[PDB]
Amino acid sequence: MISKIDKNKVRLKRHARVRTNLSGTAEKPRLNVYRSNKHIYAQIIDDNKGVTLAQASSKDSDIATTATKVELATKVGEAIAKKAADKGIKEIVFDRGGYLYHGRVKALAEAARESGLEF
């Protein structure tokens, strides 16, 4: 009876290790990424206050559509970049959430960069 690992738990161990060294400030807030089997979520968090400033998900009505997960990640990155710009945020630090920086995570990050967030 071989056990099956909980991918989210493994991810969270990795994420806590990343977050020891990576934290978001009011002037340079942290762009956190959460990834599921279907959707991708992004927040911009000031860890000094522990408050979110902007959010964007592939599950949101504005972004939900019929596209590949990577395309949805691109759209989520663009949306979060736009909302951050509207709230007056340019510098951020990218928290890959413990996921490998690749594929959907990388597409979201590059979309935010292109939309104008300065890492």
Q: CB–CB of 59/39 below 8 Å?
A: yes
Q: Which two tokens stand for residue 15?
A: 């994420």
Given 76, 89, 105, 111, the residue binding RNA (CB under 7 A)? 105
83 binds RNA (CB under 7 A): no
The whole-angstrom separation of Cα 50 and Cα 10 is 24
Taking the C-alpha atoms of residue 42 and residue 45, their distance in angstroms, rounded to an integer, is 10
Examine residue 115 and tell whether it contacts RNA (CB under 7 A). Answer: no
Joined tokens for residue 72: 């949805």
Is 88 a binding residue for RNA by CB under 7 A? The answer is no
86 binds RNA (CB under 7 A): no
Q: Does 16 bind RNA (CB under 7 A)?
A: yes
How are strands ordered across the β-sheet holding 51-57?
51-57, 40-46, 30-35, 93-95
Kindly write out the interface string for residues 40-79 of this chain, putting x where it contacts RNA by CB under 7 A and - elsewhere. Answer: -x-x-x-x--xxx--x-x-xx-------xxxx--------
Per-residue tokens: 21: 């060294």
CB 81, min distance to RNA, A: 14
Question: How far apart are alpha carbons 44 and 80 in whole angstroms?
Answer: 8
Interface ranges with RNA (CB under 7 A): 1-10, 12-22, 28, 32, 34-39, 41, 43, 45, 47, 50-52, 55, 57, 59-60, 68-71, 93-94, 96-105, 109, 119
